């Protein structure tokens, strides 16, 4: 069974459900956003599942796949591992890290992540 909340923003509402894992997502929280007036007719998989489906049906290993990418991206070598990781992770809502938020003690985070100053 699929989950009750959007994996990207943790809120309630209408979701597309992954067919190979329990995650659910708001149509607009996906990357790219899915149009509810043009929903996919067949199965649908989240980015994380899509990546594992990719890897498994690959002749090479995830270590080798990663290795060739880094070679392919030597012009931006310091970012190559960061770039490779993107496609294995589902989209999420941006949130400021705690080391920024904690600098401002008068500011609180509300129940949906919203800025609150009482």
């Amino acid at each position: 069974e699929n989950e009750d909340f959007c994996s990207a923003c943790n809120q309630s509402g209408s979701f597309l459900c992954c067919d190979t894992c329990p995650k659910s997502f708001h149509f607009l929280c996906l990357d790219p956003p899915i149009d509810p007036n043009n929903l996919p007719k067949g199965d649908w998989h989240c980015n994380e599942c899509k990546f594992k489906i990719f890897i498994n049906n690959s002749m090479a290993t995830l270590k080798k796949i990663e290795s060739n990418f880094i070679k392919q991206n030597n012009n931006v070598k310091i970012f190559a591992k960061l770039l490779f990781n993107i496609d294995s992770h589902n989209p999420k809502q941006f949130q400021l890290p705690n080391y920024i938020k904690e600098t401002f003690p008068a500011v609180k985070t509300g129940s949906r992540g919203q800025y609150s100053d009482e």
């Binding site: 699929n2 209408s14 979701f15 597309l16 459900c17 659910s24 929903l39 996919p40 199965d43 649908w44």
Partner: peptide, 6 residues
């Protein structure tokens, strides 16, 4: 594809 409301 499957949808869900909650």
């Amino acid at each position: 594809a499957r949808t869900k409301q909650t």
